[PDB]
Symmetry: C2
């Protein structure tokens, strides 16, 4: 199964543009120093993947300073598998009212064949000004596995 | 001074290093104050504030009106905002924001305390919110942000 989940997650790239996010309300995973991480949920737009949850991670900042070398990582229980696709970028500019704000996106795929409730551990690394922060935390406000295919 | 004749184009504003202030934050709708100095060297007495409105809501927010009042010892003027609607938040594209320039005249250099009246609509749900903001930087530092 881990080999069948693994085989099913290998190679595949689900492009940002092909995802149709559900109105499920976004979950705010981190929100400190003007830096937030949000999770939007979507159905896997590829066939035969009702047991796969797509998570579009959005990283935003209203900080007065730039944020550099951003890396968001995630871990999950052995019964299921998570894969992160490369992020769109790794930096955010200081807030600039002249222009529209910016965002980093990162597509997460979560294969949960046994349809067990999801409990995710994240790790966040970012540099603001001159201190590198190393945050970690938990997320569990995921939509119920049985719906995943109708989001 | 009156702010009747004073205008500060958005493009001329340089963001300070001062931590912004979150003034409203409900239903995924946030209004933040970012401070700046007065590019117009008429005097050191006016405080420029850029008001940013951002939404992470899954529906659009329409009919957005941010108003403000201040004690009679000072004046406040709000230039026309960049818009009056925000789209539903959509992670597939870049985010959106409204901005509105707010000017504060405070010659007596007392502690600024402001009151806002924010109205907007989310679908058919209507919002009539009020509040206060009293975390402006000390007026002694308005000429050096």
């Amino acid at each position: 199964h881990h080999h069948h989940m693994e085989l099913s997650l290998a190679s595949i790239t689900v492009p940002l543009e092909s995802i149709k996010p559900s109105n499920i309300l976004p979950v705010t995973v981190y929100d400190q120093h003007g830096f937030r991480i949000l999770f939007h949920f979507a159905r896997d737009p590829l066939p035969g993947r009702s047991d796969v949850l797509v998570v579009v991670v959005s990283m935003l900042s209203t900080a007065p300073q730039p944020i550099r070398n951003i890396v968001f990582q995630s871990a999950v229980p052995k019964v299921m598998k998570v894969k992160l696709q490369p992020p769109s970028g790794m930096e955010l500019p200081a807030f600039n009212p002249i222009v529209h704000p910016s965002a980093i996106t990162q597509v997460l795929l979560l294969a949960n064949p046994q349809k067990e409730k999801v409990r995710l551990r994240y790790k966040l690394t970012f540099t603001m000004g001159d201190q590198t922060y190393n945050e970690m935390g938990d997320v569990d406000q995921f939509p119920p596995p049985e719906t995943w295919g109708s989001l």
